[model samples]
Target: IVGGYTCGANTVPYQVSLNSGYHFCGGSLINSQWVVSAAHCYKSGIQVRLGEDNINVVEGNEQFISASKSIVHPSYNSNTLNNDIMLIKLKSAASLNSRVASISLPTSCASAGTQCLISGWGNTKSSGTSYPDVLKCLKAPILSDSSCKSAYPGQITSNMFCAGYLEGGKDSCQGDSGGPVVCSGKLQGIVSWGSGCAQKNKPGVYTKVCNYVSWIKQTIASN
Candidate 1:
């Protein structure tokens, strides 16, 4: 996935583009055949772009595949943004190469303060504009489960992980949803939500990728 970022907000790296040119934040190439991203990113009449370095230019030898099926987590709630993850089954697997390759998924949850990488073509600043075309990447430190709970009060759940610029000024924006949060080269989370585009006291929230490995695996297997 690839795209550009806005000014004040952090650019969400790794955009999933449809054949029609629509884009969604995405992560986790769980083999040559499947990718885990957000369900909301699946706009009708689209395809998935993987392993691209540039969103606008479509650099690299990344493959584009028509999604045979998109399985959104059954419990996904758009209102609360709960269970927002999804598994995208490509019609056919891509030929793997150095630049266009797969990444692993974490089998267990990560510890607090563990740093992770997020990339997208989201907004750069809070309330700022989005990137026209190009990919952006940033490193975010994980927040403790307790800290995350306290930060969001009742909203943060076991299915979610929190990360971002604590002092504000950097985070995923509107177009960054459903992207990956990678830790140690393993996919750990998917971008879910935030209080606002890069607001103070509000960090970016993501779906815990480790928690949904079974569903992802099963979905891909069945297909």
Candidate 2:
């Protein structure tokens, strides 16, 4: 997430960085030491700032964490943009302050029609630069399994979950990948793919957090 109190508002969403200073999109804190974000957010020397409102300036009581290691799903394919999930291991645990806190991972992630929340600093519209200082959040209802299958035909798989507005308008966009799709106050998915930002008849796709729970557990255990 971006750093700064202004982030709580829709004007300055959180932002993520890779290669030390290069910025990408936004991400959510899933745990004190772990952040659930998109695989596309992966890059060497990645550093994350939570509760920030602006990228050019440091504001708010934000927490900065250096990643000791990053593990993107081995099956991730950039071309198809499939299996776009990753985990970030921080050098140290962050304190649970107002700006930094862990989001729960859903224990029942397989259930269909689960409602979730998507937050970011992405463009309010489909084609535009990211927001400068405000964070935006929207409620997304999970699509039923049958609906997803019918919509994507053969493309929809068990590894993915669907959410967003059916009529279009509000949704995750560029630079919003690797963010959390939280449900029941727990993380159920990670931003992965979508036809476009809030496109009609095309909802956003996410990495099923429940499907990879075993891998996540093993990775955490080994580290």
Candidate 3:
């Protein structure tokens, strides 16, 4: 995340790194065996790493678990990027602890102007491969629906929301897809897409997680 601080070790314990050969997306451990991420990040042979601090080195607190199933929303529209959420089921349940645990899903939708935390191991720079070794987090306030629609005309949807500075400074960039946009101690958003990384009037766009809470639970239960 750009313009954010290095999170203290184990501060965001529910965070997970979705990996194949490298950390490509971020996810939230919502239960012992279920992870919530972005559908755009979906692929076969994904491994979920819980309790990870640095992607470049062994943090000793990491748990590598393979995904047994990946369930992308049936209505997901790649072209429009609507319903861009996904659920991953691990082959084995994670052992909850101080450095690894689950985060509760939001009970309701976050209103505009609500300050939230966005965490990821994404690029700090808008251009180039300037990804960080350690996890970074930024405090961003949710933008009004009208403002978000204005920022990206004909792009914003009810299933998506925008967060960050309109002046261009901090945002969740590439490689941070499927990461958490937490608010009020609940999982509220997923780092889905954006026009650019931390650009003026182009804040980071996230999956409106609250709208899919029922879908998430239903998918997990039926699968």
Number of the top lDDT candidate: 3
Q: lDDT by residue for model 2 over 130-222, one digit each (tens)?
A: 454455567778988776766667777778878876677767776667777777877788778777677677778888888777887788888
Which 10-residue window in model 1 sums to the lowest lDDT?
1-10
TM-score of each: 0.87, 0.85, 0.98
Candidate with top TM-score is: 3
Question: When superposed on Cα atoms, how far off is each prediction in RMSD?
Answer: 4.0, 3.9, 0.8
Instruction: For residues 1-223, write the lDDT of model 1, one tens digit per residue.
Output: 1222332222222334434565656555677767777766656655778656565664555678887777788998877778888777778987766555666778778888888878766666665464546556677889877767777888977788888766777677766677778888788888888887667778888888888888877777788
lDDT of each: 0.70, 0.68, 0.92
Number of the candidate with higher TM-score, 2 or 3: 3
**Pairwise TM-score winner, candidates 1 and 2:** 1
Model 3 TM-score is 0.98
Question: Backbone clashes per model, in order?
Answer: 24, 17, 0
Tally clashing residue pairs in candidate 3: 0
